[PDB]
């Protein structure tokens, strides 16, 4: 057995399975427990965070450290991964009672009875974020011990009802599992750190004034050098502030110690077809976009219309001229070529989409070919989602796995897939990141590559630029503060244009004080 500082023992057989970084994470989690503080397991997608949590909880109950050992814990996760958590708990620590609070569930009686039973039995209640919002009256009356939030970046909006619900738990032991705990700006980081440890980053106004405006405003292309140094100063301050409670391991410092196969992250710049280009040019020349640029109307109509046009001209639905015909969209032509090549190479492909309608169009195109597909979007019943994933992970007869990035991403394991193609960019970089890490995970025995399709000179390239800027802003505070300024664009409201190509002894402390001011 592994013996930690005070009284925490994790069983030897369980400990041996864990990797070096995973047991380092268990150590860190128990140091947080000693401090009675929350934390973020920021390890990227696929590095293993369900296993670290399961091992830490198993050692906490095993070690016998109100609550004797482990109390009644609640795990809030996306609906598609609830049964995944159940399976991992059963395989790794079968002694735990692990009930699902969901319509699928296993209880077949009043839910409130299930919450009461798990609370009074010191079991693990896995629930969804929607249920936490809905059952906040009952979920918080029972003095839970641990409130692990899997994919806790769903709490990123400080004013969302789910966030306010999840911030009602009285316990100090609040954990977030999310390999991307910053997706659009630093408000998200503040929301997460308000959840795990309400005090460190102060009130949201104060956090804005001290960190968000300095750090963000120093990343713009026109930033003055003094402002860049101020942003550096603030980013370093914030990194030091959030260091003890963020544990973020990359797949670069762990890849050598984990034997993952090679990865590629190509970004194809697809070409609008003549008809697609015509529709795009007609729309950017229309009066609606003119009204948008004048501030009269909301930008959403034009933005969504351009995204649809780049996806496929489903605005004006033009035999072999049915709705969604592949040859009318350039990205669909590229996807057809890629699918042909990969099928002749005997490989398995993971085809993502932001839009459900574009997913239906891709599904129709796949039946048009002889490819054997398998689809999972928000409409599929939750109870069948983990089965479906297992199916695609089990038999290699299934060639392509269609997905929406909101359901197909976000914590599922699809290591059976070999190639991954992100068909449509999103405004949030993190959606695309999780979608592309669905394949390159622990258990991937083959070389994976990511093909991220963008239409050249369209709104999609501008979205790619916006999310590159967001990723740079995130890296400025997650990996290093020396981040190069985003210079590719100014990120203004001219994304409506078509531009198709072709003890310290008071001296080290005083030195740090002197150096920081100089910055």
């Amino acid at each position: 057995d592994a013996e930690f500082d005070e009284g925490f023992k994790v069983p030897g057989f369980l400990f041996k399975k864990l990797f070096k970084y995973q047991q380092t994470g268990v150590r860190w989690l128990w140091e947080l427990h000693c401090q009675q503080a929350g934390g973020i397991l920021g390890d990227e997608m696929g590095l293993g965070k369900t296993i670290q949590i399961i091992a830490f909880l198993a050692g906490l109950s095993y070690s016998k450290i109100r609550f004797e050992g482990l109390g009644p814990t609640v795990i809030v996760c996306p609906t598609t991964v609830m049964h995944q958590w159940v399976k991992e708990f059963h395989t790794w620590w079968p002694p735990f009672r692990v009930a699902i609070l969901h319509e699928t569930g296993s209880y077949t009686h009043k839910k409130e009875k299930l919450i009461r039973d798990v609370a009074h039995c010191h079991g693990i209640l896995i629930t969804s974020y929607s249920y936490i919002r809905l059952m906040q009256d009952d979920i918080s009356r029972y003095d839970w011990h641990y409130v692990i939030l899997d994919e806790g970046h769903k709490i990123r909006n400080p004013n969302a009802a789910v966030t306010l619900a999840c911030k009602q738990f009285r316990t100090p032991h609040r954990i977030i599992l999310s390999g991307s705990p910053m997706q659009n700006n630093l408000r998200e980081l503040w929301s997460l750190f308000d959840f795990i440890f309400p005090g460190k980053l102060g009130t949201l106004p104060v956090f804005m004034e001290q960190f968000s405006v300095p750090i963000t405003m120093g990343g713009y292309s026109n930033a003055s050098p003094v402002q860049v140094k101020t942003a550096y100063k603030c980013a370093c301050v914030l990194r030091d502030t959030i260091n003890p409670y963020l544990l973020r391991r990359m797949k670069s410092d762990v890849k050598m110690s984990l034997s993952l196969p090679d990865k590629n992250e190509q970004v194809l710049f697809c070409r609008l077809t003549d008809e697609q280009h015509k529709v795009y040019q007609n729309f950017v020349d229309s009066k609606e976009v003119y009204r948008i640029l004048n501030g009269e109307m909301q930008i959403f109509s034009g933005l969504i219309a351009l995204r649809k046009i780049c996806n496929h001209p489903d605005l004006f639905s033009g035999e072999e001229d049915q709705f969604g015909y592949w040859k009318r969209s350039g990205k669909m032509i590229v996807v057809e070529s890629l699918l042909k090549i990969w099928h002749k190479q005997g490989q398995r492909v993971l085809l993502f989409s932001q839009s459900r309608q574009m997913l239906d169009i891709l599904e129709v195109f796949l039946r048009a070919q002889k490819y054997t597909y398998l689809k999972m979007d928000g409409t599929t019943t939750i109870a069948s989602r983990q089965p479906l994933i297992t199916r695609y992970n089990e038999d290699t007869s299934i060639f392509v796995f269609l997905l929406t990035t909101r359901v197909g991403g976000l914590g599922v394991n699809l290591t059976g897939a070999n190639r991954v193609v992100i068909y449509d960019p999103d405004w949030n970089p993190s959606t695309d990141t999780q979608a592309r890490e669905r394949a390159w995970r622990i258990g991937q025995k083959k070389q994976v590559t990511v093909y991220r399709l963008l239409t050249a000179g369209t709104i999609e390239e501008k979205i790619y630029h916006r999310q590159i800027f967001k990723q740079f802003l995130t890296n400025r505070v997650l990996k290093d503060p020396k981040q190069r300024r985003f210079f590719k664009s100014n990120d203004l409201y001219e994304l409506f244009t078509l531009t198709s190509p072709d003890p310290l002894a008071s001296s080290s402390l005083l030195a740090k004080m002197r150096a920081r001011n100089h910055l």
Binding site: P158, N159, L164, K167, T203, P205
Partner: protein, 51 residues
Amino acid sequence: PVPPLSVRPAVVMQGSARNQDDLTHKLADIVKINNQLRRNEQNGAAAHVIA
């Protein structure tokens, strides 16, 4: 109290966009400020902005 629509009728004008009564716009402002204030209570906020 929110008066009914007959007290603040909304008339379909020549332009298809509906026309709202003055009371309706005032009520919209009241709802906006009330919602913002209620937001600033469920999550704590400085007394200055609340005032």
